Design an enzyme around this catalytic site. Structure first.
Site, short mmCIF file in Angstrom:
data_model
loop_
_atom_site.label_atom_id
_atom_site.label_comp_id
_atom_site.label_asym_id
_atom_site.label_seq_id
_atom_site.Cartn_x
_atom_site.Cartn_y
_atom_site.Cartn_z
N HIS A 116 0.96 -1.13 0.00
CA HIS A 116 -0.09 -0.14 0.03
C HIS A 116 0.94 1.17 -0.07
O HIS A 116 2.27 1.06 0.13
CB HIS A 116 -1.05 0.06 1.21
CG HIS A 116 -0.34 0.39 2.48
ND1 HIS A 116 -0.23 1.82 2.98
CD2 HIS A 116 0.40 -0.28 3.46
CE1 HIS A 116 0.46 2.00 4.18
NE2 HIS A 116 0.97 0.49 4.28
N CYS A 117 0.20 2.43 -0.38
CA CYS A 117 0.87 3.81 -0.01
C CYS A 117 -0.45 4.55 0.68
O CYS A 117 -1.29 3.96 0.99
CB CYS A 117 1.43 4.34 -1.23
SG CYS A 117 0.88 4.41 -2.88
N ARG A 118 -0.39 5.81 0.19
CA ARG A 118 -1.42 6.61 0.88
C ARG A 118 -2.65 6.45 0.04
O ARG A 118 -3.82 6.45 0.58
CB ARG A 118 -1.11 8.10 0.85
CG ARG A 118 -2.14 9.03 1.31
CD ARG A 118 -2.06 9.30 2.70
NE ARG A 118 -2.75 10.62 2.85
CZ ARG A 118 -2.29 11.23 4.34
NH1 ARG A 118 -1.55 10.84 5.13
NH2 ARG A 118 -3.58 12.05 4.53
#
Length: 178
Positions: A116-118
């Site tokens: 994931h990222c943001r």
């Protein structure tokens, strides 16, 4: 050639879609999602997520402020990469390490990994695409198209050039499936 990969991401209008859902399984047992999925430990336990790769570890608005302790006693194994979503950040320096972490998760028969990222849009898709290339022997167009079919992704052009670089290297070493 970066343009080629952009054409595979879009309809051709010069605009790009954002993720329609906070999390997607993009290939069997590999999930890509956003900050809200990664920070929802009960949600993670219900999907059976055993591993979390935070491709945006940091304290800014483009980052997700978590760490190994955040997941302690949750039983979830953590790896943080303090990557920035800009043209110039050299995410390729982390391809090997992220692929090894994805491999470590999938080597377990009940393992599932969330990268994931943001937003789940630029950094983490790049790592999954690179993983598919170096460990499932896919060329970049194949790997990217498979991920894009399952999530609205959009690596920045710097990340796309780095994937192209990885592709020529893997092609030169003859390490891409025919």
């Amino acid at each position: 050639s970066v343009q080629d990969l952009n054409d595979l991401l879009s309809d051709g209008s010069g605009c790009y879609s954002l993720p329609s859902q906070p999390c997607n399984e993009v290939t069997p047992r590999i999930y890509v999602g956003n900050a809200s999925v990664a920070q929802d430990i009960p949600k993670l336990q219900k999907l059976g997520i055993t591993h979390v790769l935070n491709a945006a570890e940091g304290r800014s608005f483009m980052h997700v402020n978590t760490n190994a302790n955040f997941y302690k006693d949750s039983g979830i194994t953590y790896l943080g990469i303090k990557a920035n979503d800009t043209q110039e950040f050299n995410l390729s320096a982390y391809f090997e390490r992220a692929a090894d972490f994805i491999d470590q998760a999938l080597a377990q028969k009940n393992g599932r990994v969330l990268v994931h990222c943001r937003e789940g849009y630029s950094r983490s898709p790049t790592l999954v695409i690179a993983y598919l290339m170096m460990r499932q022997k896919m060329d970049v167009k194949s790997a990217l198209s498979i991920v894009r079919q399952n999530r609205e992704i959009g690596p920045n052009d710097g990340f796309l050039a780095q994937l192209c670089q990885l592709n020529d290297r893997l092609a030169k070493e003859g390490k891409l499936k025919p």
